[PDB]
Design a protein around this ligand. Sequence first.
Ligand SMILES: Fc1cccc(F)c1CBr
Length: 162
Amino acid sequence: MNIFEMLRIDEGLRLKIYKDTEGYYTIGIGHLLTKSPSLNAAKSELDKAIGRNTNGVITKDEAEKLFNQDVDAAVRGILRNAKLKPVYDSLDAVRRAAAINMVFQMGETGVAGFTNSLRMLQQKRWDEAAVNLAKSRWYNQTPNRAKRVITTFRTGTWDAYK
Ligand SMILES: Fc1cccc(F)c1CBr
C-alpha cells in the first residue's frame, strides 16, 4: 500500500468521461474535469489536460499520467496551506496518505470545516479524531470510502485497504 494504490482503489479507473459521486464530469482515476454541467465544456478541459483531440476517451497511460500529476498537486497544496501543513508534517506516512486522500476528493476548500478534526489529529487523539471526522457531509455522502480513510487515521495502518 501507498497513496497511489490507495486512491486507485477509492477512485477506480474509467477511460471515458463519467460523472463522479457529486454529478461532475470526471475521467481516469478520479480526475475532475469541470463542475460545469456542459459535456462540451468537460470535453474541452480533457483535450487541454491531455494535449490532443481525445473525443472523450483516453488511454490507461494517459489516465495514470494525470493521476500522478493530481497526487503531486494535492500534496504540494497541503504543504502550501498554512493550516494543513503543520498537521500533515506531524503525521506518520500512513496517516499522511489518508490526508492526501481527503484533499484529492474534496480539495482544500472541502476540508476547511475540518478545523476540529485537524486539531485532534495533530494532538494524536486518534479515536476522538475518528469520531469527529464522521460528523460530516463527507461521511454521509461517501460512507464506505470515509470509513476506510477514517480507519487509516484511527489506526495508522492499511487494514481498511487490505
Ligand atoms: F490531517 C490532515 C492534514 C492535511 C489535510 C487533511 F485533509 C487532513 C485531514 Br482533515
